[PDB]
Ligand binder design. Structure first.
Ligand SMILES: O=c1ccc(Cc2ccc(Cl)c(Oc3ccccc3)c2F)n[nH]1
Ligand SMILES: O=c1ccc(Cc2ccc(Cl)c(Oc3ccccc3)c2F)n[nH]1
Lengths: 400, 551, 551, 400
């Protein structure tokens, strides 16, 4: 109930990011929400002497909800929430049988925001056809979506959770942005009973609250098919997969398989699978089940996620820091954008659990299409970084 | 007057101090006009005399019967904080709901009617010099938003908005649009009730320091506004005359294209491609450019479109938006948005090339996207589309392509030419068809190429290329294989680049080579394309790399 | 009237027959106006009734008190031969010699005053339809150049030229400029003698069927012509108002740039770069674009230039032309052409980028070339140049560079910033300096790079790149070597591409990598760059290719 | 004195080439020349119903001269002057001790041009500042610069030369465009006396007439320097020259020299020239004196000339049909453009003598600079094809 000073560093000004056009229902939804927030003292109208801007959107049940996009502010304020007031990530969270994600962002509205920092939280409700100049506001309390909010609030969160942790020392609780990740090894009914217990703790501090199974997360291997009989084409694809796999995995071998493709053959021609080849092939499969030897999470590097559209509602993905040195691979399986936004949320959630941060995504989609549609299906309180890329059709093939 | 509205607090930029610019000795005529003009502003509160303690200064000038004070705020402007942008956009007429009555009010002396932050005024200091600068000049500072200062447009519009807020709240069915010094006020009241409402707006504005013209001075619809004409129940662009000229200069063609582009908001079918092609190259502004025949053709068709006037309708939120797109030639697309069949709200076109190589399906989807974003801006919802593509054609393309996309509710409409894929690559290798193992090789220094192939039927060939890159030779190889093969062919390449381009079924390209590949692909009955890793000793690929690797 | 001048013979295109287009049933109002209009033309010889044997036809229309006959000659036009272009260019005022008197004569009914080839007239057939097309329409053909026909502009101007030839020959000191329907006649006669001369020109024109206005209708200088204002002893562009706007749309910025460009012919120092940078990307015509600070800066400086009016002088062939060029920022150059110090004939600018990478010396020479071609157009001779470059700087650059060039007579003038080379590569390898053998390698499929080096002092290093081509890695290698070396360094590459770029001493580039290489090169005291053939087992190059070839 | 029909073929229209701006003195020069030509019936004014255009220029002593640029018409009329009415090129011309070039274009004005072909010879005298619409003309007689002119006139030329050839059967005479190339083995005084004899023959048919030594043309070899002592840099340049030379010449070897460059050496380091190396090197020199084994003139292919600016008024050049498979190499040695136009004329003249046609030139110069200035120094009656190219700095180095 008294504010923590906040900086940017010396030479990096606040966000000046444009507001992406919103549909009518979303705009109306936002002015209701905002008029209330103002009455409650949480935000204040601002004048043109505030040059800053952060985009806002509305997402979802029947309840609308405000989603501010602080991706820029977060980058520009990184020293504060990461190094000055970092929240340590527990390695044990990924080891748990069940992890429940609770939304705790209501708690942040109780704490006031440093007055010298408020201007940087400016946003704009736009109007249809630019008919009215658009409603301008800044935050007076810790805003949802800013990484400084949990950074500042962690001291209170510890107080709030102390009793629960003391009484349940094998449950692990981790705060990330507006969420609490709560993991246990308890049987599912007992796990759920403990989650409700935690809500009641949280409810006493004002926070009326709105299931992952990480131990059963196993890498999607690069799949080498087993076949009745192999054509020349089939082996060429196999040599292709294995070739590019050998740039990731120490020990992958294609020499045997390569001799099976002698000279200028018909792609359609069937070929007898030599025993030397079936050996090398079976040993390759073994290497591909295990994790990549030589790759490690580097806490100082950004995570990157690539996603390939596989058709028939199938999506494959890879998380890495150095290109192709995969830390994790997986799959996900209604329209393309809807599914893509589902994949992105699943991948981001996994990444938060596993490394305590979110990757920058390489999305196989046109910028404008994504931007028009992503909020139509987005359910999460955060937004990860993305750029827009054209998938090399071969990388799609190698991951099934 | 000077509005009693509270001031906006203003800062200089963090590290910077206020301007200390020296006043150039002025001419007596100019000194006299400035003194006269300043006296008058002083007597209306706009400026105040200041002591010699104030260390700041900005140059002043006078320019012509009529004398105008011109203050050069360049330095102050560099030194003053950034402000919020005044608007994200201007309204489009197509988005406007029809009102029974609309009046224009222009605020008189807008800027000079708004107070400047008391703490900032000192930085607006300026000096009327004495004759030949002999003696101390007369010193003033602004109490109000100066003309030419960086914050004036922003602080004014914000002031007007605060001032309007209450009136808006107690009149939620009136629509007021603010645009610079202007206010456009519309209602669905009976004419007499409207004029009463305008009068109490004028009173409300006068209460807050803003004078406005009397009813005998209020402008009559049609309003010319921002290149549009706004009539009681229709809108259009202002009149376009395509000049008749014997010789077209670069400058005339630029202006022609600008007018055609502007005209395309409501005149359907306008094209600009062939006229645009002329402006390529680096030509003088006054240089005459001979019209090609295609430009000539394009210009004449634009003239037919513009011979009869066309108008758009206003928006009725109780109905849906329907958007239709027609293909008009390669690259070029045309669209109309309407609520009732063929009473257009607005019109437009899309030409853009995304990438080097593309197909009509991809283009249509990009056009649907552009129109989708436009509709959310103008109307706050997406239209129902009517597209010249079969559901089956669309389904087939996007279920197989590797990029994600999704267009909203749409229906097929048979308005040819229809969007279709012109060929389809095979999913499996083809039995009874010759396998061409292709490869391309280029010397980095001499730019000398070898493109060729070997087949499973023993056919071998290797041509010689000159001034090609490695990328071109690998494409030349694929082209050779297409030229020399039957109606069915398997092709094996080690070029991911070549593969990528061709696997997207382009039917159109910036590259000449690629267009020749497209011609061939269309004529084939079946083509299967495949990739293998280079230099991994793979049968066929190794055999071709030999004869291709020569110099 | 209809000139007694002989007709120009006209053909259809070799393979084609005349147009047989069907007449749309017209409205009675329109049929009535056409009959009235045609009767009147018939009685003046312009058109003639024709029998039903003539099988050709072109559509006719009427459009609005006032009725206008509009013939749609699109098909005929497609079918009629190509003609010689009407002009290679329009005159620039700066090129005009000052005349004591100048009159404008506008030829009345220009086209309709010129006969059409008797053998071609049949193809201009058109039909006034009967009410509801019940009965045969009234059929005409043109005897004179139709409005909208492809040959009219060309045949008219050629006719006027033949008609003027004799008058020109017997009045070699009078200057007549033909422009569409207009004639601009100038002389150095005393006012009374001039008006006599105009009168006998009008008589000569009337002898050949061309009517012209009386003295009481002849326009007074200043003449507005083609965006210029032509005063008795000066010229300028027509008045430019840079609009004050809160929000700039794509359309407004396009128009602003057009006006600034036009203004740059006589207003020196105008810039357009930062305003142009905004128009990049693909934005809606009506979309608001926030001005950057650099655009804001550029716009304000343009406003200072345009606050006071500027004019140009006319040309005096008894004096030399002098051209001066000043560097105004990167890429941007500005020039003035004058005969007497600072009484400008005209003004201009040059921004263009030739290539991806360049230096100020190269740019200056390109600017000198553009101004040279312009001067030969306008004045028929090259100017004496005054350049902000030392003779020694120029000498050094072009004697060493591998392209040929040559600029005409020029002199150095100290108007900073001065054009200079910012670094110079060594001619010989450097003793006591470390030799860096560099190389770059990129996987064609994964786009994963390795840029690194080995030195003669045993230093070895290999970084990891991502999403780079082979060309970028070879440039990254050279950059690494520059970063990690002393003030003197020899560098050995196997990349001809990298070599080419750097051997031209660029000081400016579109590429980010190249600009970083430039920063380094400037800071070095000595750099020698060398090339060897790749994969030829050369010492050092082989050693680096090893550690660089990894994935 | 009665015309030979001329075609283009079915589907290729005449030239529509723009007139490049001319200086005042050149324009005035052209209207004098043209007014005379019209009075003499050689050209006629034309109207706008002629859509065609060919550029004209004026060149030089004090006498100006009209130069029409029929490069386009020549391409579009190739079947006529090459296959229908070809002039055979004598292989013996290059073997002669002395060759004299005589201008014979005046002879062409005596023959009338096919009336159906005249329109294609349209040209335009432009005016300063576009003040007058520009004077339009076409030819009524065989025009200078068109390849059809000598093609048509060859029948007359044979008559004219029959006596001279019969009396001097070891003198070879070859017509190319507006020139006669006259070669002999006579001593120079006797050669010159015979040239004057030929002028008198020509003078009887109206042609008042305005010394190459081709037997003494020898290829400029790629020069391998001989040095006191070799640095690492020196050998690298030698290996570089020889490497690229081995793509032209069968038998060039660098293996020995390459071992002399062991590992990571200082460029400045001196190296002892091994005997195995000095052998290979001396054998390379021998190969480079001789002509390229494997390359031959192909009469159906266009010749291409590349020119490199070598500094100090030095120019090197190469003629070839397939890139780098050189048929000829040479050098030439006041400003860059002046010299470049001299090189081009010398190279074109050599090419006419040697193969009976002119090469398309690759010029190391900006398009506009060349175009502004080339006619300021051009002396020839023909104009070869050119494009404008950036010289690779290595190709410059390998040719000295
Ligand atoms: O009679 C009419 C005439 C026009 C309209 C459409 C309309 C409706 C409301 C307002 Cl404030 C209008 O005024 C505007 C003028 C310019 C820009 C935006 C709005 C406007 F143009 N409605 N009724
Ligand atoms: O009094 C004057 C006014 C202007 C001039 C310059 C001048 C001289 C001669 C002629 Cl035919 C002029 O008329 C022209 C008008 C437009 C374009 C070219 C020429 C012209 F503009 N000379 N004397």
């Amino acid at each position: 109930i008294e504010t923590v000073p906040v900086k940017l560093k010396p030479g990096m000004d606040g966000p000046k990011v444009k507001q992406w056009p919103l549909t009518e229902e979303k705009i109306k939804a936002l002015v209701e929400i905002c008029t209330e927030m103002e009455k409650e003292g949480k935000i204040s109208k601002i004048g043109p002497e505030n040059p800053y801007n952060t985009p806002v959107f509305a997402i979802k049940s029947t309840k609308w909800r405000k989603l501010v996009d602080f991706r820029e502010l977060n980058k520009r304020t990184q020293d504060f929430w990461e190094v000055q007031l970092g929240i340590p990530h527990p390695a044990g969270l990924k080891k748990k049988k069940s992890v429940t994600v609770l939304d705790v962002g209501d708690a942040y509205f109780s704490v006031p925001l440093d007055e010298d920092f408020r201007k940087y939280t400016a946003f704009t409700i736009p109007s249809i056809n630019n008919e009215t100049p658009g409603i301008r506001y800044q935050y007076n309390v810790l805003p949802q979506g800013w990484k400084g909010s949990p950074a500042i609030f962690q001291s209170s969160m510890t107080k709030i959770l102390e009793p629960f942790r003391k009484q349940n020392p094998d449950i692990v609780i981790y705060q990330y942005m507006d969420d609490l990740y709560v993991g246990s090894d308890l049987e599912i009914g007992q796990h759920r009973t403990k989650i409700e217990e935690l809500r009641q703790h949280l409810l006493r501090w004002g926070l009326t609250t709105p299931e992952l199974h990480p131990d059963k997360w196993t890498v999607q291997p690069i799949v080498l098919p087993e076949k009745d009989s192999w054509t020349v084409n089939d082996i060429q694809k196999l040599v292709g997969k294995l070739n590019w796999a050998s740039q990731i995995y120490p020990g992958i071998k294609v020499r045997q398989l390569c001799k099976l493709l002698r000279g200028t053959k018909a792609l359609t021609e069937v070929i007898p699978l030599t025993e030397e080849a079936e050996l090398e092939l079976a040993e390759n499969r073994e290497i591909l089940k295990e994790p990549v030897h030589g790759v490690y999470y580097d806490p100082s590097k950004d995570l990157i996620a690539e996603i390939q559209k596989q058709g028939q509602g199938q999506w494959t993905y890879q998380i890495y820091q150095e290109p192709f040195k995969n830390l994790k691979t997986g799959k996900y399986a209604t329209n393309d954008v809807k599914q893509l936004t589902e994949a992105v949320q699943k991948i981001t959630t996994e990444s938060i659990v596993i490394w305590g941060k979110t990757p920058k995504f390489k999305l196989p989609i046109q910028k404008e299409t994504w931007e028009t549609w992503w909020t139509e299906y987005w359910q999460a309180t955060w937004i990860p970084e993305w750029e827009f890329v054209n998938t090399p059709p071969l990388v799609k093939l190698w991951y099934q | 007057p000077i509005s009693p509205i509270e001031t906006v607090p203003v800062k200089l930029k963090p590290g910077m101090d206020g301007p200390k610019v020296k006043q150039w000795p002025l001419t007596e005529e100019k000194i006299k006009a400035l003194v006269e003009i300043c006296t008058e502003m002083e007597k209306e509160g706009k400026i105040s005399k200041i002591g010699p303690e104030n260390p700041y200064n900005t140059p002043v000038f006078a320019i012509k019967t009529k004398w105008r004070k011109l203050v050069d705020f360049r330095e102050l402007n560099k030194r003053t904080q950034d402000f919020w942008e005044v608007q994200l956009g201007i309204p489009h007429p197509a988005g406007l709901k029809k009102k029974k009555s609309v009046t224009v009010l222009d605020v008189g002396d807008a800027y000079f009617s708004v107070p400047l932050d008391e703490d900032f005024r000192k930085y607006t200091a300026f000096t009327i010099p004495s004759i030949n600068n002999e003696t101390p000049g007369i010193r003033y500072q602004y109490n109000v938003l100066p003309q030419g200062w960086k914050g004036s447009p922003a602080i004014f519009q914000s002031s007007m908005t605060k001032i309007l807020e209450p009136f808006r709240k107690q009149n939620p069915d009136i629509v007021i649009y603010q645009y610079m010094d202007d206010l456009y006020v519309g209602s669905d009241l009976e004419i007499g009730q409207h004029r009463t409402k305008i009068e109490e707006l004028r009173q409300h504005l006068l209460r807050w320091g803003l004078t406005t013209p009397d009813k005998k001075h209020q402008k009559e619809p049609p309003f010319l506004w921002m290149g549009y004409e706004l009539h009681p129940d229709k809108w259009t662009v202002q009149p376009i005359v395509l000049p008749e000229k014997d010789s077209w200069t670069v400058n005339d063609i630029q202006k022609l294209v600008g007018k055609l582009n502007w005209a395309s908001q409501i005149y359907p079918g306008i094209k600009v491609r062939q006229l645009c092609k002329l402006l390529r190259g680096t030509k003088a502004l006054t240089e005459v450019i001979p019209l090609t025949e295609e430009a000539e053709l394009e210009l004449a068709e634009n003239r037919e479109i513009l011979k009869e006037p066309v108008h758009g309708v206003y928006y009725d939120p109780s109905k849906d938006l329907i958007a239709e797109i027609q293909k008009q030639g390669q690259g070029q697309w045309t669209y109309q948005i309407y609520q009732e069949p063929f009473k257009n709200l607005k019109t437009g076109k899309y030409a853009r090339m995304r990438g080097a190589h593309t197909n009509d399906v991809k283009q249509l989807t990009e056009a649907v996207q552009k129109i989708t974003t436009e509709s959310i801006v103008i109307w706050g919802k997406t239209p129902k589309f009517k597209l010249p593509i079969q559901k089956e054609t669309w389904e087939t393309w996007w279920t197989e392509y590797w990029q994600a996309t999704w267009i909203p509710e749409w229906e097929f409409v048979n308005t040819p030419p229809l969007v279709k894929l012109w060929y389809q690559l095979e999913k499996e290798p083809i039995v009874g068809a010759e396998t061409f193992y292709v490869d391309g090789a280029a010397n980095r220094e001499t730019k000398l190429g070898k493109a060729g192939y070997v087949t499973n039927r023993g056919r071998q060939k290797v041509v010689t290329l000159t001034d090609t890159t490695n990328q071109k030779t690998e494409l030349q190889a694929i082209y050779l294989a297409l030229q020399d093969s039957g109606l069915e062919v398997n092709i094996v390449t080690d070029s991911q680049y070549a593969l990528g381009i061709i696997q997207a079924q382009p039917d159109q390209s910036e590259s000449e080579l690629v267009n020749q590949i497209i011609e061939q692909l269309i004529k084939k009955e079946k083509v299967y394309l495949a990739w293998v890793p280079a230099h991994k000793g793979i049968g066929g690929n190794e055999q071709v790399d030999k004869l291709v690797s020569a110099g």
